[PDB]
Amino acid sequence: IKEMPQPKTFGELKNLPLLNTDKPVQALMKIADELGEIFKFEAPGRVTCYLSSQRLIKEACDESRFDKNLSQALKFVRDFAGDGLLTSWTHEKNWKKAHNILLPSFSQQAMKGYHAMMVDIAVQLVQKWERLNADEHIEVPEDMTRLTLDTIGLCGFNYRFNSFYRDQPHPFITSMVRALDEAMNKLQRANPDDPAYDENKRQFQEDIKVMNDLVDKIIADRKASGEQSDDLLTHMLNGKDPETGEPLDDENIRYQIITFLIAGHESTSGLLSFALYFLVKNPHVLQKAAEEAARVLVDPVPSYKQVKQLKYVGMVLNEALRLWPTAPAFSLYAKEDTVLGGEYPLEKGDELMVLIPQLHRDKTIWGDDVEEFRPERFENPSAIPQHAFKPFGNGQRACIGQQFALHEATLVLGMMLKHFDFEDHTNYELDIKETQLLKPEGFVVKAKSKKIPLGG
Ligand code: HEM
């Protein structure tokens, strides 16, 4: 039994002077490099335990001992995401109901039914870049976000945000993005009740009404027509929990739809953006991935089967998730008193945070050269030690979207590689902005079309 390592405390401020950054995850990674696989972190009225090694994370992933904790970020997002799957406690009846109903709609098989709609949006991005003039460039995370938002709207509830037809997004997207920003801003608000935030609160209420009005109207519209689509909304309307026999109610369906948008859009666009970053920074890797794309994508548009063939592309995506997992942490609490790693007692209710980018740099698992981009690390996924790679979280609370995110990213990145050569025309210096997610801010490229016809 051992005292938990902890960075220096500064009287009443505790450890907080060490995080005076807008990139706390990257600052926490530097604390972990100094203090090792576990450290306690304290701030006024807050205590948590950050884990970074696979040995201890293997323990924290034991679901009989630890469950998902709702961080404060997730609590503020629950004000519009409600008791959707992301923002609900594992014990809530609606979490378990929605999980059992939605799981089959997110399986690897279910991907065959979404493929045509994902291709629809992916063709639109390819055509946008084909139609650029010679002087222009691409804003990478901005277009990736247009793409992921549109794909989740189409596959999620057969709704077109039409993000490629716009400079300013659809009013729902504007509201959702501003609501997420406000939720994150509230994390660092000293005097939340101060008059200067009256306008913030009013706007937050307006943005939630915009989101709810839209989604409720689409739900009511669909129930009236009886139209059956290939979308998740049809599955929610027709699904019954195998355990209770009950369906989701209309209000819970609204929260799942908002949740899929929130949970899916930034995380998946970050992944595509970092993968393209790594590829333009490693032209030899980019060449091997484009060669696979040209070998495999032999039809004017990709089939479901062809996407499954893009093995190297899949490896590039995993190695981007290893270095910069776009949802960089998840939070747990001890379900009962327990001892972690034989050494550190925990009391029931104690919080742990898994620091996924630091887990992914555990040199005992990956070798000494953990900063290098090498997709070949993933050539044999069965050989990777259990719990070493956790970009989609853990257990029954893992990413329900993982097969959807991966199928979409593979498809898109494979089409990009087939149709364009890319140029890092500004010699872009990586700048990782943190919201609740990671992205390469300001990342721009030029693409030069290979002049290959689309379909079809
Ligand atoms: C590369 C893309 C993505 C990454 C890295 C990612 C990562 C994660 C992580 C780490 C969790 C666990 C959160 C926690 O424990 O607090 C999570 C949960 C979740 N994600 Fe994703 N995600 C991605 C894409 C998506 C997509 C495309 C969707 C939906 C279409 C989605 C929907 C969800 C949902 C609904 C949950 C809550 C699941 C549950 O608790 O039952 N995610 N994701």
Side-chain angles (χ1 to χ4, degrees), residues 1 3-208 210-216 218-222 224-226 228-456:
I1 283 146
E3 199 197 347
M4 188 177 300
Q6 181 171 4
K8 187 73 161 58
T9 57
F10 303 86
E12 78 295 346
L13 313 167
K14 301 287 153 166
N15 305 126
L16 187 59
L18 313 174
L19 280 192
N20 203 15
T21 171
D22 284 327
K23 303 171 177 185
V25 170
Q26 304 159 71
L28 292 157
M29 294 163 71
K30 298 183 196 89
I31 297 169
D33 291 330
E34 186 193 339
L35 292 189
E37 71 178 340
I38 182 170
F39 58 94
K40 173 158 62 181
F41 185 98
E42 296 176 88
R46 180 186 163 52
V47 56
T48 192
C49 177
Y50 280 90
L51 299 186
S52 287
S53 69
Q54 181 268 359
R55 161 188 93 90
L56 292 179
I57 285 154
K58 209 172 32 202
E59 271 189 75
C61 291
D62 184 343
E63 298 174 288
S64 75
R65 298 171 68 198
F66 302 95
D67 185 24
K68 169 151 161 168
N69 180 43
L70 293 192
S71 57
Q72 190 64 53
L74 281 187
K75 291 169 170 162
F76 284 141
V77 168
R78 175 175 178 126
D79 286 344
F80 52 91
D83 60 356
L85 281 171
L86 182 60
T87 57
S88 67
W89 294 97
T90 298
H91 64 261
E92 301 186 74
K93 155 154 192 187
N94 270 339
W95 174 78
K96 180 50 156 158
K97 260 229 293 210
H99 171 81
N100 290 346
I101 290 163
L102 287 166
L103 262 186
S105 288
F106 281 102
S107 63
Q108 187 57 46
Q109 289 298 292
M111 295 314 109
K112 303 189 199 174
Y114 304 121
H115 175 85
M117 290 165 302
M118 296 184 181
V119 171
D120 181 304
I121 306 308
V123 164
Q124 294 189 47
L125 169 84
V126 172
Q127 291 179 322
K128 178 179 174 168
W129 292 356
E130 297 276 26
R131 291 165 175 168
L132 295 179
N133 301 297
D135 51 20
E136 315 182 85
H137 61 268
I138 293 164
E139 298 169 327
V140 172
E142 294 70 11
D143 273 339
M144 299 298 106
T145 291
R146 283 183 178 100
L147 177 119
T148 62
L149 269 162
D150 282 29
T151 299
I152 300 162
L154 190 54
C155 291
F157 64 126
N158 192 35
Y159 190 79
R160 280 185 191 267
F161 295 115
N162 288 312
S163 296
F164 298 117
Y165 291 92
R166 295 185 196 262
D167 294 297
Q168 281 131 328
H170 197 285
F172 172 108
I173 290 177
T174 297
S175 282
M176 182 186 66
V177 163
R178 198 161 40 209
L180 291 161
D181 286 352
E182 169 63 16
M184 193 199 145
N185 283 343
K186 283 185 198 183
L187 291 163
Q188 292 216 126
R189 201 162 283 176
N191 312 53
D193 327 317
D194 189 82
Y197 301 120
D198 285 346
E199 160 62 45
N200 299 241
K201 295 176 157 81
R202 191 207 50 73
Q203 179 64 82
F204 188 66
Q205 289 316 300
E206 188 183 283
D207 289 337
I208 288 168
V210 163
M211 288 181 279
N212 292 345
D213 283 355
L214 182 70
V215 177
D216 287 352
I218 292 148
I219 296 167
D221 286 352
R222 181 71 62 82
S225 58
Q228 300 301 291
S229 280
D230 282 327
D231 72 355
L232 280 155
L233 171 55
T234 297
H235 297 132
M236 293 185 280
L237 290 170
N238 289 342
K240 296 180 173 275
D241 176 14
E243 296 170 12
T244 58
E246 294 164 30
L248 292 181
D249 69 29
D250 292 349
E251 168 175 316
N252 193 257
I253 297 185
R254 178 227 289 160
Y255 290 136
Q256 304 302 344
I257 291 164
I258 285 163
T259 298
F260 300 146
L261 289 156
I262 282 169
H265 82 288
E266 245 180 307
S267 55
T268 304
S269 64
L271 170 56
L272 283 160
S273 299
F274 279 116
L276 180 63
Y277 168 87
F278 283 116
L279 291 177
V280 307
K281 296 302 193 173
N282 294 273
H284 283 157
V285 172
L286 171 30
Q287 184 177 321
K288 177 167 182 203
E291 288 170 355
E292 175 177 79
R295 210 150 66 229
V296 168
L297 304 176
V298 296
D299 290 326
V301 290
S303 75
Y304 169 87
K305 272 186 214 177
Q306 291 166 339
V307 176
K308 296 306 110 182
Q309 298 166 36
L310 295 172
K311 166 158 209 253
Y312 195 75
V313 178
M315 296 158 59
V316 164
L317 285 175
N318 286 325
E319 175 70 342
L321 292 173
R322 186 187 69 80
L323 289 162
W324 295 115
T326 184
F330 55 94
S331 181
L332 297 172
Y333 71 93
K335 290 160 54 71
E336 297 293 349
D337 294 348
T338 194
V339 183
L340 192 67
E343 305 173 292
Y344 306 102
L346 298 173
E347 290 185 321
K348 171 180 218 311
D350 285 356
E351 194 205 328
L352 307 179
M353 293 286 327
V354 175
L355 188 51
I356 303 177
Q358 197 68 8
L359 163 67
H360 290 175
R361 283 162 175 77
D362 182 336
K363 290 172 181 186
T364 77
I365 301 302
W366 304 100
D368 257 18
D369 72 336
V370 288
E371 301 294 340
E372 314 307 310
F373 185 78
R374 180 160 25 99
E376 289 84 5
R377 290 180 205 269
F378 287 88
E379 247 157 14
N380 187 2
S382 91
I384 294 155
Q386 68 152 40
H387 303 310
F389 183 61
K390 295 212 69 99
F392 290 110
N394 183 60
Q396 72 190 332
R397 309 303 303 274
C399 186
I400 205 176
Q402 162 178 355
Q403 295 77 222
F404 187 104
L406 292 172
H407 187 85
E408 191 186 0
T410 301
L411 165 64
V412 169
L413 180 51
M415 285 170 79
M416 283 166 54
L417 287 172
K418 172 179 168 175
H419 281 285
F420 301 98
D421 287 311
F422 287 94
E423 187 198 352
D424 169 24
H425 70 293
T426 71
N427 183 25
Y428 166 72
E429 190 195 10
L430 184 55
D431 179 347
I432 294 178
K433 181 181 160 116
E434 310 186 10
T435 47
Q436 282 321 285
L437 299 140
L438 302 193
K439 63 163 197 147
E441 187 166 4
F443 175 44
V444 295
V445 292
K446 286 178 175 180
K448 163 126 195 210
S449 178
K450 292 182 187 276
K451 292 308 185 222
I452 297 148
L454 281 158

